[PDB]
Symmetry: C2
Subunit: 626 residues, 2 copies
């Protein structure tokens, strides 16, 4: 029933798509572009005037219109967005490659929220002609898929920015034991600077990207910690590593220029190579030769300061001030916390966004890139962080969160507080809320039974009912979550598992020590087989979730991890049985006293911690090393 005047055909088609998310009421709306504001909406009694500064801003304007019209007839909206560009970057390199259909849904939602820009982070997960091992069995996007994704974003006047790697974070590529790949290597996950075959590869990266319309790219260059120290050192000897970086940076910028690209890079290696203790968060002594080189290069690249951790504006401001010593062409990357296992932390994301937004505004930052990393196997749902995305959008357009829940429900059908219950498996009640990375969702799940190396981080009196209540809270939200139900069903089941598994290893030890054989038998014969049944159920839900959002490729690692967990539970059953049958004097596993897993949060009152590597969660034995 909605009637619009002043739209192009492109804008009317975009709106039809968006009717799949939002419900437009029966009113008349005159639309025009105007520089007066990012978004303005006025009128009453069913006749409204809507203006946008930039085309893509029509779609957030419509979300605002729908929302405000439910509680009032008169409308006085005026928004002035703080940032020239607000982007969302999805991790497609951690095993989870967003599928094209899910990319389109994400684009639609981002448009409704007010984002200008959609980005995919692809280390090796885009195809390059003549590089058959690059993205092999990883579900690398074809050039056609990226074009499709980008053209879809272009239907909403949302631009596309690929985030690639031109130095390090190429582990999945460089592992292939063929001459054509090994000759490109320096050390660990780092390409060999100065090798012409490496610049042939990088040229090929841009040949693929040049098939897109976009001429904006993030070239990576973060976290190349041993750059110059491997095969580079053997071949070339000791060199000034700050200058090595500039040299490599210059070659890459020249290749980009060849294709007409404008580059951004992560900023951290400048700080780590030019500070005394090799850290990001440092004031730097720039050697003069490097200063002269950076002075040239700074006019050709945007440096991206990334920080997901600080709880105050001042901390951000300090780093911004450090960055100004190098360059005033800066962007900021904030965090949509979805990289700590199975379960996001939209809560923590909200806490730090508020403070990062203050700092970005103070330093006239042109662009914020919200980053959804998927560290260590991509086990968190791609749509798990919609609340964090709306949060950053509200902060840009309105500089407050007053409209957050209403805008969110208009866009998704859920209140933001219901949706943010998705975080529950991380939200142990005794955590302060301002400390990052505390991820019991993941380490309680993948921990062994017989050898429970995180057991000192468990607080069963608190944790068991928290997890138990969370599973019920989430089944209730699932029932009202519409097409988002899958996300909550997955989390409810996980929480149900963690309710019992959080201390099953401890109860086995207490029974063993107390010589309570009836209890060991109960655990071995009833509880553990049921635990496997529940984990299998969870695996089925996870798989459904994964196949909805992502390509099939990379799910294999989760199959392996979860099958291993299941087999280790069976071991706990069988070892207990052998003991019960009188054919073991002792169960040696249980004779070992448990130590703290890590001391990272050892001085806090709470017991939980951060453990975010599957292979160290699951076993104290060797598993990847030789």
């Amino acid at each position: 029933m909605v009637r619009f005047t002043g739209l192009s055909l492109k804008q009317t088609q975009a709106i039809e798509v968006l009717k799949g998310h939002i419900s437009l009421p029966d009113v008349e709306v005159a639309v025009t572009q105007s520089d007066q504001a990012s978004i303005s909406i006025e009128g009453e009694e069913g006749h409204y005037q809507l203006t946008y500064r930039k085309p893509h801003q029509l779609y957030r304007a419509l979300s605002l219109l729908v929302t405000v019209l439910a509680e009032a007839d008169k409308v006085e909206i005026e928004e002035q967005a703080a940032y020239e560009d607000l982007a969302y970057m999805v991790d497609c390199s951690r095993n989870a490659v967003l599928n094209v259909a899910s990319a389109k849904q994400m684009i639609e939602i981002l448009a409704l929220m007010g984002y200008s820009t959609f980005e995919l982070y692809m280390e090796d997960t885009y195809q390059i002609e003549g590089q058959p091992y690059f993205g092999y069995f990883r579900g690398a996007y074809s050039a056609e898929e990226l074009q499709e994704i980008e053209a879809y974003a272009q239907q909403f006047d949302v631009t596309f920015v690929p985030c690639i790697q031109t130095l390090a974070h190429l582990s999945a590529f460089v592992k292939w034991g063929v001459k054509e790949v090994q000759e490109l290597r320096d050390v660990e996950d780092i390409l060999l600077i100065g090798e012409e075959k490496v610049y042939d590869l990088i040229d090929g990266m841009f040949a693929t990207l040049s098939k897109l319309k976009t001429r904006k790219v993030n070239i990576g260059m973060d976290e190349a910690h041993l750059v110059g120290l491997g095969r580079y050192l053997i071949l070339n000897g000791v060199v000034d590593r700050s200058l090595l970086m500039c040299q490599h940076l210059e070659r890459v910028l020249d290749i980009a220029d060849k294709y007409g690209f404008h580059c951004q890079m992560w900023s951290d290696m400048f700080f780590k190579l030019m500070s005394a203790d090799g850290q990001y968060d440092r004031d730097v002594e720039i050697p003069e030769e490097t200063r002269v080189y950076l002075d040239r290069l700074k006019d050709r690249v945007t440096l991206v300061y990334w920080d997901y951790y600080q709880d105050s504006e001042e901390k951000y401001n300090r780093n911004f001030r450090n960055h100004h010593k190098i360059s005033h062409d800066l962007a900021f990357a904030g965090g949509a916390w979805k990289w700590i296992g199975f379960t996001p932390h939209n809560h923590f994301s909200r806490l730090v966004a508020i403070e990062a937004n203050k700092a970005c505004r103070a330093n006239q930052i042109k662009e914020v890139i919200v980053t959804g990393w998927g560290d260590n196997g991509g086990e968190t749902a791609q749509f798990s962080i919609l609340p964090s995305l709306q949060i950053w959008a509200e902060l840009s357009y309105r500089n407050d969160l007053d409209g957050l829940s209403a805008h969110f429900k208009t866009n998704t059908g859920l209140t933001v507080e219901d949706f943010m219950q998705i975080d529950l498996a991380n939200l142990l009640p005794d955590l302060p809320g301002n400390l990052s990375g505390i991820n019991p969702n993941r380490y309680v799940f993948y921990q062994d039974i017989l050898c429970p190396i995180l057991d000192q981080h468990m607080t069963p009196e608190q944790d068991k009912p928290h997890f138990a209540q969370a599973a019920e809270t989430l089944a209730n939200i699932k029932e009202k979550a519409g097409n988002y139900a899958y996300l909550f069903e997955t989390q409810a089941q996980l929480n149900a598992i963690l309710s019992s598994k959080v201390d099953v290893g401890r109860r086995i030890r207490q029974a063993y020590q107390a010589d309570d054989k009836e209890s060991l038998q109960q655990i071995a014969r009833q509880e553990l087989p049921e635990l496997r049944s529940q984990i299998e159920d969870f695996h089925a839900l996870f798989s459904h979730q994964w196949l909805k959002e992502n390509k099939v490729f990379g799910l294999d690692t989760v199959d392996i991890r979860m099958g291993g967990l299941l087999q280790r539970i069976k071991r706990a059953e069988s070892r207990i049985e052998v003991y019960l049958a009188g054919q073991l004097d002792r169960i040696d596993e249980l004779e070992v006293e448990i130590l703290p897993f890590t001391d990272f949060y050892a001085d806090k009152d709470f017991a939980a911690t951060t453990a975010n590597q599957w292979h160290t969660i699951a076993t104290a034995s060797t598993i990847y090393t030789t």
Copy 2:
């Protein structure tokens, strides 16, 4: 049997060894003599047996039983080429040899002619005040190490711990506590010059000093990035050959404090001082390093290790390279048991014969046979007995003419039957002189839907080879006595491989041909059966492991095999979804398979070397962030 001339200690040791060998009802006069390593004369039921060194009595007895089984008259005289022959067991790759198996190993080593038993322990021995060192790894207590040693002493066999004082400490340094992290340079390497590192090393030697032995191998191999991590950040750039010497001096000073005499792997001197970072190089020694190194080389024996060469002259070249630095050298050879589930006694033989030639020509005094367990310790500890008997024969006789007979006396199997244990590796079109080709492992752990090693499979030959191996090994199991477990495990493995070698390919063929009957059959019959077979193999493997090793470290294999099983279920479920019409394609099967590696791409055969579980099993990330 009746002996004269024995001590109480000797008569006690012979009692134990009757558990392995059958002494005939004969009269033997025993005396020490310097005339030969071993001598045996006599006839008509009366024999004279001499030995040079006490432990050599036990080889002599194995010899006597053997020769008497087809002759009344005996004329034996052996002169061993090596002052010491040792076997070193890897107890650091997850598999920690349990005490009961240590005792069986010592007994067999005694019968073969070995003077020395060694255990390689990175973090798998207990250090007071270092609770994370060996944590949940089954680290030997001092009491256990003392027990293993005293048991070896019963046979006049000496004990030498092999430890790590620089790198190869990855299982220790992973632990994210300040007490451990402060000790780190980079990767698996300790931080040279950090006093808490030297506190740790002092603790290592405090544990070992509880032993009687005062001989130790201090490690120091393969510290490739030494100086380039935290060391570089804290201290800046330094001469890495001088850095090495500094650290080596600290370590030898600690050893001296506790009375130890040290050996070390020699590779880092060559790698740090060669231009291309390689071991097999004649190196120019920087002047300051030469001064430092000349001091140090008088305090440590260098161990040249090499397992891979089929020619004497390659060994000799490296001996020459070593002699430019020092003449205080020992040699380490290999009993190949570090390439998965299945050993390579055949390749071990090939290289032993040539290495023995080179060692003799360079007047090497001690040979250490090394039984590494790379990447999870999945090969059985007693899988390499033939390789051990080979080195013993090469030392004492300089040939293998007595090999099978002495082996049979010692184990109950002919050496030919025992070495069938290798079969999962012995693909028919391989030449026998190329190292590391291990289809036993990569055929087993490969995925079904995404078979990244498929190009290395030759089903026309591999399939019957493996099927025929399973039958052969089932026959040998039946005559193998207490070694039956070893063959039973391998028989089941070969049975699995005969179908798994191409199941991934046949799924792909069926899919492309649109042979849905065959996709159904594979999904509903063959793959569930394959899982049942793998579960049985897991059961057999577990039995073997728990018989030979401590329980710790089996968890990794559970994890790995658990994951394989779960991936086979995924193969089944993805095919069913396709068959039900709920996918237009199975994307996994649309990917063209490339060579896994080009390491042996120049050769006529398709097989290769692939010895990392995590890269065998998936092309996705799995340990990286």
